[PDB]
Amino acid sequence: LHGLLLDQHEEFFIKQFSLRVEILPSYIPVRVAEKILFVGESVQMFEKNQEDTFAAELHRLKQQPLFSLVDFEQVVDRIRSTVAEHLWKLMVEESDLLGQLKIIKDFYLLGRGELFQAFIDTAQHMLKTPPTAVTEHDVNVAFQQSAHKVLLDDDNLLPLLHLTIEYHGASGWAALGLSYKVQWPLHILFTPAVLEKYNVVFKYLLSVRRVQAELQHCWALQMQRKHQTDAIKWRLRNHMAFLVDNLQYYLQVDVLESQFSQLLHQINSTRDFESIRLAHDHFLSNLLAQSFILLKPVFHCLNEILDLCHSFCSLVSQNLGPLDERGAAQLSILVKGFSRQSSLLFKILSNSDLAQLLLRLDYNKYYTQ
Amino acid sequence: VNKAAVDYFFVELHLEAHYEALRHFLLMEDGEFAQSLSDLLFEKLPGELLNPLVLNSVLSKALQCSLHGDTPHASNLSLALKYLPEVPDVLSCLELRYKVDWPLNIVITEGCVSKYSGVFSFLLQLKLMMWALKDVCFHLKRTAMAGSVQFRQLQLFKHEMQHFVKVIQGYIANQILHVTWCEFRARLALEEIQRAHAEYLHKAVFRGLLTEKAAPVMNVIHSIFSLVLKFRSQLHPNFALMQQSYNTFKYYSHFLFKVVTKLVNRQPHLEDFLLRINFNNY
Amino acid sequence: REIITLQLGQCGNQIGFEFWKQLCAEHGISPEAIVEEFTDRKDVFFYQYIPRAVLLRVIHSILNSPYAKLYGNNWASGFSQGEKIHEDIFDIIDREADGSDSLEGFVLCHSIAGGTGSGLGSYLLERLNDRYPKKLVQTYSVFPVQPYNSLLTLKRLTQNADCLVVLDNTALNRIATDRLHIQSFSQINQLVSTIMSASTTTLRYPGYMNNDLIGLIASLIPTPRLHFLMTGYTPLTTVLDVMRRLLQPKNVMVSNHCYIAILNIIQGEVDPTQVHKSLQRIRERKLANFIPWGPASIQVALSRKSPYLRVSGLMMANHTSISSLFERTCRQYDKLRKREDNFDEMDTSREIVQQLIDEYHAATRPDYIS
Amino acid sequence: REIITLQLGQCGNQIGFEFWKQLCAEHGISPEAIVEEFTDRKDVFFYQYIPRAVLLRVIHSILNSPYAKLYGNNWASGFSQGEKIHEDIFDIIDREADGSDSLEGFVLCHSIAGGTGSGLGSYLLERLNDRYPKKLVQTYSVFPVQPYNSLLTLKRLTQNADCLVVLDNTALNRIATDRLHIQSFSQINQLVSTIMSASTTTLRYPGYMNNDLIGLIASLIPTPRLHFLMTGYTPLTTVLDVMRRLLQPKNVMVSNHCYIAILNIIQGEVDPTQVHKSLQRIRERKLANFIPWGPASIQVALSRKSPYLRVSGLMMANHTSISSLFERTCRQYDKLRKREDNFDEMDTSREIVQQLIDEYHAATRPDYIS
Ligand SMILES: Nc1nc2c(ncn2[C@@H]2O[C@H](COP(=O)(O)OP(=O)(O)O)[C@@H](O)[C@H]2O)c(=O)[nH]1
Numbered sequence A: 001l002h003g004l005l006l007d008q009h010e011e012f013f014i015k016q017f018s019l020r021v022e023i024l025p026s027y028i029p030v031r032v033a034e035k036i037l038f039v040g041e042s043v044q045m046f047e048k049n050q051e052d053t054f055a056a057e058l059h060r061l062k063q064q065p066l067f068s069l070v071d072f073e074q075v076v077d078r079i080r081s082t083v084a085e086h087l088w089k090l091m092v093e094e095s096d097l098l099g100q101l102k103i104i105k106d107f108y109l110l111g112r113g114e115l116f117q118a119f120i121d122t123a124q125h126m127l128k129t130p131p132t133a134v135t136e137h138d139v140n141v142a143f144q145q146s147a148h149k150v151l152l153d154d155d156n157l158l159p160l161l162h163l164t165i166e167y168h169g170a171s172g173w174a175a176l177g178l179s180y181k182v183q184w185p186l187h188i189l190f191t192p193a194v195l196e197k198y199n200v201v202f203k204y205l206l207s208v209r210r211v212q213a214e215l216q217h218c219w220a221l222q223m224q225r226k227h228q229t230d231a232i233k234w235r236l237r238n239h240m241a242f243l244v245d246n247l248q249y250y251l252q253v254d255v256l257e258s259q260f261s262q263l264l265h266q267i268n269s270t271r272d273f274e275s276i277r278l279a280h281d282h283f284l285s286n287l288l289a290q291s292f293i294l295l296k297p298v299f300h301c302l303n304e305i306l307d308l309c310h311s312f313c314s315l316v317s318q319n320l321g322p323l324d325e326r327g328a329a330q331l332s333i334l335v336k337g338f339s340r341q342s343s344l345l346f347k348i349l350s351n352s353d354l355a356q357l358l359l360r361l362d363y364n365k366y367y368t369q
Numbered sequence B: 001v002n003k004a005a006v007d008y009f010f011v012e013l014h015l016e017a018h019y020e021a022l023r024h025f026l027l028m029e030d031g032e033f034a035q036s037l038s039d040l041l042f043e044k045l046p047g048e049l050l051n052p053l054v055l056n057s058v059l060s061k062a063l064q065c066s067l068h069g070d071t072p073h074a075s076n077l078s079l080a081l082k083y084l085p086e087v088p089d090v091l092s093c094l095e096l097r098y099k100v101d102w103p104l105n106i107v108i109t110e111g112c113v114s115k116y117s118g119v120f121s122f123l124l125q126l127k128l129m130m131w132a133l134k135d136v137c138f139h140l141k142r143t144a145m146a147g148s149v150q151f152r153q154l155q156l157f158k159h160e161m162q163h164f165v166k167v168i169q170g171y172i173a174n175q176i177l178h179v180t181w182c183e184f185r186a187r188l189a190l191e192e193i194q195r196a197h198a199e200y201l202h203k204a205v206f207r208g209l210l211t212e213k214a215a216p217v218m219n220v221i222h223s224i225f226s227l228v229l230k231f232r233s234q235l236h237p238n239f240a241l242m243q244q245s246y247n248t249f250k251y252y253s254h255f256l257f258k259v260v261t262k263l264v265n266r267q268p269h270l271e272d273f274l275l276r277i278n279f280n281n282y
Numbered sequence C, D: 001r002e003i004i005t006l007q008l009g010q011c012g013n014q015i016g017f018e019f020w021k022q023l024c025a026e027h028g029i030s031p032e033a034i035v036e037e038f039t040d041r042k043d044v045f046f047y048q049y050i051p052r053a054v055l056l057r058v059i060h061s062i063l064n065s066p067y068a069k070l071y072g073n074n075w076a077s078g079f080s081q082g083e084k085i086h087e088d089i090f091d092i093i094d095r096e097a098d099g100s101d102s103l104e105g106f107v108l109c110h111s112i113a114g115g116t117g118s119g120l121g122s123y124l125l126e127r128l129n130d131r132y133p134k135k136l137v138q139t140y141s142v143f144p145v146q147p148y149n150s151l152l153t154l155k156r157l158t159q160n161a162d163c164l165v166v167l168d169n170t171a172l173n174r175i176a177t178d179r180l181h182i183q184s185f186s187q188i189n190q191l192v193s194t195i196m197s198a199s200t201t202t203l204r205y206p207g208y209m210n211n212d213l214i215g216l217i218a219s220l221i222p223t224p225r226l227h228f229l230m231t232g233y234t235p236l237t238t239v240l241d242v243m244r245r246l247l248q249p250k251n252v253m254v255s256n257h258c259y260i261a262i263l264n265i266i267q268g269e270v271d272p273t274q275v276h277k278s279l280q281r282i283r284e285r286k287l288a289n290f291i292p293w294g295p296a297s298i299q300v301a302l303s304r305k306s307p308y309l310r311v312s313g314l315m316m317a318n319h320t321s322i323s324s325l326f327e328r329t330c331r332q333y334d335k336l337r338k339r340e341d342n343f344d345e346m347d348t349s350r351e352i353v354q355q356l357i358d359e360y361h362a363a364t365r366p367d368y369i370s
């Protein structure tokens, strides 16, 4: 009720506080122990009529000559739901939780994708080289220039995004990261742990957004080269290697704009605060699974398609004429590996892979492989 | 008590007035005063200009040409000194201290006013350029028939050197007088008054390139200010002697743009400087 | 990445204004080109507000409208005029290119039947490829001495315009009678503007992909030859409801055969979870035939309707049945060739279009490659 | 330091009158030259109130105005009349000169459109350099046998007037019809008086920088030859709104090329924290182009409006495009030179301006030095 503990000998079963199990009573269930620790931490971090009534109820229990567990929970569950209801008010109505979530979906989950394609166009040569101690700030001015480049102007929420470079403990993209300075009220919901799993997703989603862009540039390079017999072998493999990434880049609006549609629904329905802490924690857990990141095989197979395509788009752009000096001799090496990986993933597919295979085989082409 | 203590200061003793008044005099915000004080002192230049008969009286002649002041606030401007100069440089040490009474002395610290004297001697030193440089711009006017390559090529140096001073001044007139004054004016509206004031001035000496952290940026400024003074000495008998001087000026300025850039990786205040010194150039 | 739009010929200048009055209406833009009070990314078509247009008798009709502050008939005759105003118009075009930050494409509205279009539209496509070689040139051309203007122009659109969308007036005049009951030009243009507007929906609103003109076309055109598309506008309610009306040829403006790739655009607020359920039943019913040679897929995209102005729908189709329309035209061309300085350019043009119709008829075979 | 004005011809006496009305309105000065009850230093223009005016037909109506208590057609004839009253008029100047504490400059409001004042303007500047060699002179000349009287006074203005603010009636009337819809003389001058009033915002109100007439001119004009300026006045809302609306050629009061120096005066109470941000966005978009040789920048200073009388702003620039205006004039001269006691002064006049037109075109080259 007051956010402080009166203990000096390691007596209470609550020692950023934690919970103790090896000293917890026997008949008391671990469930209600989770309820207690939450109401106490929520007041400590917080630093009318809901005070005296809780006191008398606590005192009344001491007069009962029999501790009935069915009644001990009967008073605690009201107190938990009491502080949670008022906290849910502060977490949504006064402090716009939904507005912050929209900003998250934009910059962390590539929601504002148009900003990141111009960001790549500028911060391209200053990242392909191995990162050093100066490229950390050399790119922040490019990103700031990018937001102003698409007439998105707001002195709010712009200085809250500071790109980091994991240096001295390799290409620059392998160490790129984006941190967000959370405000005070939302600190209870945004720990560095939940902001860490968000950061991992941002690296993978930015990778596939990079390879599709430079690949589309190759498409504009063949079209530009309209007037060699072997010259057609490029687009017969380019357009082939295009559908393996483009469709891989689909199912993402069908997993982001869908899961996000449920999390945005779960808040506007329940008045409790505990629901938010579990639904949001459940919402993020799907992104690790549905986006095929945790599953090593699908994560280890398409991983090779990324860097294999880098060599291809670079090879065709590294020359201005036909691939003659061992260039065609080099193109014939990737197709011997890629075309096998195409059938390899076809065997991996044959819970959610149907939503991916349906788009890949609606035209029934992979049935022939 | 506290709400009645702070309110007692504003509505009765005019704490809001003293701040917006010392800025009119110390930080030289009110024109026609610095342009009249510095303009008088610079007319002379040892034993003269040091006795309390001229420098203790030039102020009482300056305030009349202010057209703003002559109030009980306007007094207490002790135009004293802190050194006896012996004898082309860019230094003339001289202080200018405000004075207060009891119920206000407890807030405005006797150390804070001492730091105004730190930022003042810089701002006065700046005026020494825009007057001496104005002199050669005016000294050359009477020379005008005499039109030749030696003449026009000479005057382009002044326009090339003046613009560098008129941009570093435009910076000072943006950080130490307007944005650092936006804060501490919409910040106020009893212990806090001590710290808020200790944060207003401290930002004024930080954005003012007087901090020892960015001191190497300040050391280079003297090389610029010195060469302009030499340019004033040679008011075409010695043209080439001046042509070498300007070439030294273009080198040092070209060196400043590199030392400030290298000091960006390690201060958002300095960020606006490069945008000032560099614009459509390298 | 902005797109400079050009409009030539009477038909082209007419559809553009109706495309412009439609676009600025979707945003909060007053006819005086000033924002009204009343997220929507508006940079792709407007310069900081002015639209990046270059309009080329009818101009008087445009300046008399309250939107004033918004800014012979032979193939040989139209071309000759072009070379005479060569330098005059390019300074207008060049200054708009340097003004833009990173110019990406060139939207063109012109009619092959239109004399001015058959003379001036054809000349630009050769010059545009010469001066700026790294810029896509996509045209919203519309099919209708008449066969001559048509085939001679098709000779340029098959090698210069790296993309193209055809709008046939025959099917449009038909749709006007059955589901609109008009019987003029001033009524059929209403639906034309609807197509062009929804065609560029994903670009004007921030999304996940499809943030450039390349983001839409590259999935459709696999080879430099197969570069012809078709559109379909259904609403004249679930996600499965809208798709079953797309594939019906009763709404597609057209008069074995199979597609190449499909792009679906949905402008409603439908639940994006059941879209994967809709595709499954479509593959089960097998409502559209495909190519067996290469890997292809059916795509769908979502966006948001203009709030300041319910589910709509537009589909982008790459069908080989569009080759028949060419044959009909070229058939009439051969008909006038045997009935009536060198008369040789019209001869080679007939040969090069023979390759195009050949490429599509050979595309519907299991051995289209080589 | 006191400033004094002189008004010549019919034009100068008209705009100077409304210049005296608008300025008298800024301070709490009744039309009867008496302060009403109702910071601003009013001593630079007014002398105890009495304005330092010197007026040289319409004067009768000026005294007939409620502000009475506030005090041929050839060029050679306009020059002759100035000689016939050499000493008679000059006494007024002298008695007003030393009777003033410290004269700083001489504001000259006159027209060069063939008026008796146009010659009358040529004479005074010759003598002003004769008697007072330490007194700056500024002139707010206005542009339209008219080629004759125009090109002649240019010969005197390029060597006597150390500064000049050009105002062409042509670019003014474009503003009149567009944003005031007049389709008169007393209608356009309403805006002209506004330009001059805000031109001295930093003088009547004390500030840190630019507290004197030499404080504004010394930065822009690099050499005593390239001494021509143009103006801008946008309010007809943050800082990035003002400076961006100023650089447009739709607002400039003038009919390769680049700038030498700009000065933007902001009169509002705007938040000064964003003035550096607007400077960044103007640089990055590259909306203006400067000289390549020397480091040329843009400067901005703040001041406060008249509390008695909303964000205003003035733009002062030295653009080498002003050379085109002269080319329009002198070209007419050669045409009138072949169509119609010595006629030798007209020769050296045409000669000296052609040196100036050479001096501008040479400033735009990266090797302007030597
Ligand atoms: N869809 C559409 N087509 C038009 C319109 N106006 C003209 N056309 C087409 O243009 C052709 C006639 O060309 P015409 O205007 O005579 O060419 P011009 O004389 O060079 O302008 C017809 O076959 C029409 O199909 C219009 O408003 N909409």
Ligand SMILES: Nc1nc2c(ncn2[C@@H]2O[C@H](COP(=O)(O)OP(=O)(O)O)[C@@H](O)[C@H]2O)c(=O)[nH]1
Pocket (backbone or CB within 6 Å): D008, D009, D010, D011, D014, D015, D072, D111, D113, D114, D115, D116, D117, D118, D142, D143, D144, D169, D185, D186, D188, D189
């Ligand atoms: N900009 C402007 N120009 C004017 C105005 N009134 C007259 N002028 C110019 O003055 C010229 C006529 O001069 P005029 O009065 O006959 O000369 P005067 O008789 O010697 O004073 C015309 O060519 C006009 O362009 C005015 O209100 N504004």
